[PDB]
Amino acid sequence: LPALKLALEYIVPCMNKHGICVVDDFLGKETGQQIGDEVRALHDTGKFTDGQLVSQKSDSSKDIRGDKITWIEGKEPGCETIGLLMSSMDDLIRHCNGKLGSYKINGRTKAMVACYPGNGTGYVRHVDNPNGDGRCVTCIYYLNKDWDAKVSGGILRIFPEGKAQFADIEPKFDRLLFFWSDRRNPHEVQPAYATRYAITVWYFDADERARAKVKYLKGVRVEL
């Protein structure tokens, strides 16, 4: 699918109606596989953090750690297919510009690459952007060949505002997900029993981010 077609015929109407959108087979398998090798390579060469402290036991031999991360700009040695994905995410968003809510997306973060190490850790119920920091859309790409959740866990459970029900999304190979970052979409990752990779970028709305600047707040100091 051409990027603009996916945008106009799927991502735009779906986001505006449901605020959660799944595109399967986004880059195809040669390119997915390649991103996979790049992410595994970052892992094996120790580029990730050790993982979120889950259980801080008193003896610390026995501390339990969870999701590991690394931030990627997209041009680093070893990361060029990741840079490629990011560029591809950007192209898709830019083809939706204007058309997702009344937002005007002018910015994103670096890619946050996450590895749930498969030791039964997950990620607690949260909202990505609760306090108005400018992030309007979360975009995650999943890396996980032949993932079977019945076996390996690691479902993303989203809990849309004012719904009795949730939405389970499997972290399937070459799947791209978008959802609104704010309190509309509380979500969690259920415990993962196999190594589970995902790559997230967040997109900024211009107005929200411009006044987050003010609210939050050397520099951005000047003078006297």
Residues of this chain that interact with Fe ion (CB under 5 A) are 128
CB nearer to ligand UN9: give 95 or 192: 192
Assigned token pair, 2: 């051409």
Which of Fe ion, ligand UN9, none does 172 bind, CB closer than 5 to 8 A by kind?
none
Which of Fe ion, ligand UN9, none does 156 bind, CB closer than 5 to 8 A by kind?
ligand UN9
Select the residue interacting with ligand UN9 from 182, 187, 203, 204 (CB under 6 A): 187
Which of Fe ion, ligand UN9, none does 27 bind, CB closer than 5 to 8 A by kind?
none
Residues preceding chain discontinuities in the chain with C to N over 2.5 Å: 217
Alpha carbon of 127 to those of 26, 136, 184, 185, 208: distances in Å? Answer: 25, 12, 8, 7, 16
Closest residue (Cβ) to Fe ion?
128
On whether 126 is known to bind a ligand per the annotation, the reply is yes
| CB atoms closer than 10 angstroms to residue 92 | 18
d(CA 16, CA 23): 15
Select the residue interacting with ligand UN9 from 26, 48, 103, 123 (CB under 6 A): 123
CA 178, 158, 28 angle in degrees (round to 5)? 40
Select the residue interacting with ligand UN9 from 86, 89, 149, 189 (CB under 6 A): 189
Please provide the DSSP assignment of 177-191 as one string: EEEE-STT--EEEPP
Alpha carbon of 140 to those of 9, 20, 46, 56, 169: distances in Å? Answer: 20, 11, 22, 29, 11
Q: Choose one: 9-17, 30-38, 86-94, 122-130; the region binding ligand UN9 (CB under 6 A).
A: 122-130
CB nearer to ligand UN9: give 95 or 171: 171
On whether 67 is known to bind a ligand per the annotation, the reply is no
On whether 128 is known to bind a ligand per the annotation, the reply is yes
179 HSE (CA, 13 A, CB side): 26
Contact between 20 and 26 (Cβ < 8 Å): no
Shortest separation between residue 153's beta carbon and ligand UN9, angstroms: 12
Shortest separation between residue 8's beta carbon and ligand UN9, angstroms: 26
By DSSP bridging, strand 64-65 and strand 20-23 are unpaired
Applying CB under 6 A, the residues found at the interface with ligand UN9 are 67, 69, 114, 123, 126, 128, 140, 156, 171, 187, 189, 198
As annotated, the binding site includes 126, 128, 187, 196
As annotated, the binding site for Fe cation includes 126, 128, 187
